[PDB]
Design an enzyme around this catalytic site. Structure first.
Site, PDB file in Angstrom:
ATOM      1  N   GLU B  51       0.790  -1.229   0.000  1.00  0.00           N
ATOM      2  CA  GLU B  51       0.000   0.000   0.000  1.00  0.00           C
ATOM      3  C   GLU B  51       0.822   1.279   0.000  1.00  0.00           C
ATOM      4  O   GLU B  51       0.845   2.014   0.976  1.00  0.00           O
ATOM      5  CB  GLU B  51      -0.924  -0.006   1.235  1.00  0.00           C
ATOM      6  CG  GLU B  51      -1.715  -1.323   1.203  1.00  0.00           C
ATOM      7  CD  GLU B  51      -2.639  -1.550   2.361  1.00  0.00           C
ATOM      8  OE1 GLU B  51      -2.254  -1.629   3.513  1.00  0.00           O
ATOM      9  OE2 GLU B  51      -3.889  -1.755   1.987  1.00  0.00           O
ATOM     10  N   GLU B 127      -3.846 -10.679  -0.660  1.00  0.00           N
ATOM     11  CA  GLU B 127      -4.687 -10.683   0.535  1.00  0.00           C
ATOM     12  C   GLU B 127      -6.070 -11.058   0.155  1.00  0.00           C
ATOM     13  O   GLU B 127      -6.576 -10.525  -0.850  1.00  0.00           O
ATOM     14  CB  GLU B 127      -4.829  -9.408   1.397  1.00  0.00           C
ATOM     15  CG  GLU B 127      -3.528  -8.785   1.915  1.00  0.00           C
ATOM     16  CD  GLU B 127      -3.816  -7.330   2.217  1.00  0.00           C
ATOM     17  OE1 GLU B 127      -3.625  -6.476   1.371  1.00  0.00           O
ATOM     18  OE2 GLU B 127      -4.367  -7.058   3.384  1.00  0.00           O
ATOM     19  N   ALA B 129     -10.042 -13.109   1.919  1.00  0.00           N
ATOM     20  CA  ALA B 129     -10.785 -13.728   3.022  1.00  0.00           C
ATOM     21  C   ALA B 129     -10.307 -13.201   4.371  1.00  0.00           C
ATOM     22  O   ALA B 129      -9.672 -13.941   5.152  1.00  0.00           O
ATOM     23  CB  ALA B 129     -10.571 -15.249   3.044  1.00  0.00           C
ATOM     24  N   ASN B 187      -7.162   5.910  17.068  1.00  0.00           N
ATOM     25  CA  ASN B 187      -6.857   4.480  16.922  1.00  0.00           C
ATOM     26  C   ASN B 187      -7.947   3.849  16.089  1.00  0.00           C
ATOM     27  O   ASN B 187      -9.002   4.479  15.856  1.00  0.00           O
ATOM     28  CB  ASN B 187      -6.706   3.723  18.272  1.00  0.00           C
ATOM     29  CG  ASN B 187      -8.002   3.772  19.064  1.00  0.00           C
ATOM     30  OD1 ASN B 187      -8.937   3.038  18.694  1.00  0.00           O
ATOM     31  ND2 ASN B 187      -8.135   4.752  19.992  1.00  0.00           N
ATOM     32  N   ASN B 194      -7.528  -9.662  12.883  1.00  0.00           N
ATOM     33  CA  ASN B 194      -8.065 -10.208  11.652  1.00  0.00           C
ATOM     34  C   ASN B 194      -7.586 -11.617  11.448  1.00  0.00           C
ATOM     35  O   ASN B 194      -7.651 -12.126  10.329  1.00  0.00           O
ATOM     36  CB  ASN B 194      -7.416  -9.365  10.523  1.00  0.00           C
ATOM     37  CG  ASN B 194      -7.604  -7.845  10.692  1.00  0.00           C
ATOM     38  OD1 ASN B 194      -6.757  -7.030  10.298  1.00  0.00           O
ATOM     39  ND2 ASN B 194      -8.675  -7.433  11.360  1.00  0.00           N
TER      40      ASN B 194
HETATM   41 NA    NA Z   1      -6.219  -4.805   9.983  1.00  0.00          NA
END
Ligand code: NA
Ligand code: NA
Ligand code: NA
Ligand code: NA
Lengths: 409, 204
Positions: B51, B127, B129, B187, B194
């Site tokens: 990213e 990346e 699911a 935050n 995850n």
């Molecule tokens: Na995350």
């Protein structure tokens, strides 16, 4: 069997136009075109002979060129003295498509330098470019989405004799039903068909009369050099006959004849003689070296049918097989046999989501039923075996979207 | 093996990676990695980072690796998952059948992505699911697809372990904490959990 299409007599002068080819090439944005007309003669060659090719838009003459015979040098022995090529510049041409069938009239005059007309031949011209680029079939630079149907030349009363009335009728129902293309299953059609497609506006697949389905294996003849001659004529004569119709956008090598060396030869022949149009063929696997389009029959949307030698992959998977880049247009899909067409939307949704799925041709247009009469002279619809014919395949000749009388299913 | 380069919060995302003045700092993060790990067999693919949009800096570095270590493919998802800085179409969260046609960086159905005009690369999700809490619904849909299409060669689920941290209450008993639980702010609360397994490695 029989003399099922027109018979006629034609009178040509001794010095004559024996052939002519019409081509249209465009600039990057189609704002400019060049019409090239190759004209050939038979007859005594003479200095005063000329060819005039004139282009009209309705009653307006948009372009013209005249010239004496004698093509350019082509090899060590010279050129074609019996030929000549006229090149006509057309600015902002009105383009041909099924959405807007714009046409021009090309008039080819064979005459003396000094004015005396020997004869004139002519044709309608559709300015359009057909081309496969980067995996997409483009028309006038835009990707087609084929709403097609396969159509035999069938008549419940007349059999295989085709009349204008019927043709017109078929055309309109098709247009009225959102179809934009038709496939000549599986033979060159009556001449008038092409003219009507040109005029009303439909994309046409012109297909050679070559089908050897009953063989074992299917390519038994097509793979045999001894049959190359008979086959070639089925291809070549079609091309020489229909190459000027703008409606014809793709040539097809025939149907269900496996895949033979003969197809390869013939495929190259066409590409050689007429680069303006893609060539397809489904035989032997639908993605052979003899076809510019992956054109399977009955491959399912999501469902793989891994037959041996000739699997029918899910159309969406087919596109992304390693090394594969061609567009996919089903030569046949959605068998309209009886109470059928379940899962049709599924195909459309896929055609709309994937750029290289550019549609297909439904199988097929009209039921091949023949009218018969009962003891009290009342007519009824007959199918295989209804004439003492045997072996037969019963109702399998009935797979259309419309009934033989053209009433819709 | 992934260079330590992520500039997610810039606007647009490639603000620095497209700047030649950042090429240097970026270069070291790529070069020093290859230099260090180039002898490990387990490393099979190099990754330019994560990213940071798609900038010229990525093209230059992509080229550097290819040049210095032809043994491994280089991938990078930034700027659209299929830029000229990647040997692998490696999107994050592209769906199996469903297109998400975001402008500039669409996420097409993976099945669809593979056959877009001129596309020929293999596709492995960097990346997929997103395993946050009660998730993984639709996992099977991917597997079916990967099995069916040769060019769909799998992916990396997001992610292995929840990033919870242990804190204790008055009683002295341990509790799993997340975003903002340390007085941190702004935050992202639970977004840091995850995983397929809890922080202690107990499976979800
Ligand atoms: Na995350
Ligand atoms: Na499509
Ligand atoms: Na049939
Ligand atoms: Na796969």
């Amino acid at each position: 069997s029989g003399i099922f299409r027109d018979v006629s007599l034609l009178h040509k002068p001794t010095t004559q136009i024996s052939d002519f080819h019409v081509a249209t090439r465009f600039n990057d944005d189609f704002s400019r075109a060049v019409l090239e007309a190759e004209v050939q003669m038979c007859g005594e060659l003479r200095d005063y002979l000329r060819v005039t090719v004139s282009l009209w838009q309705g009653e307006t003459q948009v372009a013209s060129g005249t010239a004496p015979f004698g093509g350019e040098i082509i090899d060590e022995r010279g050129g074609y003295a019996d030929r000549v090529t006229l090149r006509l510049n057309v600015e902002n041409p009105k383009l041909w498509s099924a959405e807007i069938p714009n046409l021009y009239r090309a008039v080819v005059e064979l005459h003396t330098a000094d004015g005396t007309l020997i004869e004139a031949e002519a044709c309608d011209v559709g300015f359009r470019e057909v081309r496969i680029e980067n995996g997409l079939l483009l028309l006038n630079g835009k990707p087609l989405l084929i709403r097609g149907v396969n159509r035999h030349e069938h008549h419940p009363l007349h059999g295989q004799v085709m009349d204008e009335q019927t043709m017109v009728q078929d055309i309109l129902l098709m247009k009225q039903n959102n179809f934009n293309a038709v496939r000549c299953s599986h033979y060159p059609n009556h001449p008038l068909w092409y003219t009507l497609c040109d005029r009303y506006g439909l994309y046409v697949v012109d297909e050679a009369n070559i089908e050897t389905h009953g063989m074992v294996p299917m390519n038994r003849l097509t793979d045999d050099p001894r049959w190359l001659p008979a086959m070639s004529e089925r291809v070549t004569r079609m091309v020489q006959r229909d190459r000027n119709h703008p409606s014809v956008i793709i040539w097809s090598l025939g149907n269900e004849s496996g895949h033979g060396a003969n197809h390869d030869a013939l495929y190259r022949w066409i590409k050689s003689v007429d680069p303006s149009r893609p060539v397809q063929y489904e035989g032997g696997g639908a993605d052979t070296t003899a076809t510019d389009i992956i054109c399977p029959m009955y491959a399912r949307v999501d469902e793989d049918q891994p037959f041996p030698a000739v699997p029918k992959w899910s159309i969406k998977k087919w596109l992304s097989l390693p090394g594969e880049t061609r567009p996919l247009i089903l030569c046949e899909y959605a068998h309209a046999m009886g109470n059928s067409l379940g899962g049709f939307a599924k195909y459309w949704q896929a055609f709309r989501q994937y750029p290289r799925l550019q549609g297909g041709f439904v199988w097929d247009w009209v039921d091949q039923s023949l009218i018969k009469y009962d003891e009290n002279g009342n007519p009824w619809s007959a199918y295989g075996g209804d004439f003492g014919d045997t072996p037969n395949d019963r109702q399998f000749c009935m797979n259309g979207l419309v009934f033989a009388d053209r009433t819709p299913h």
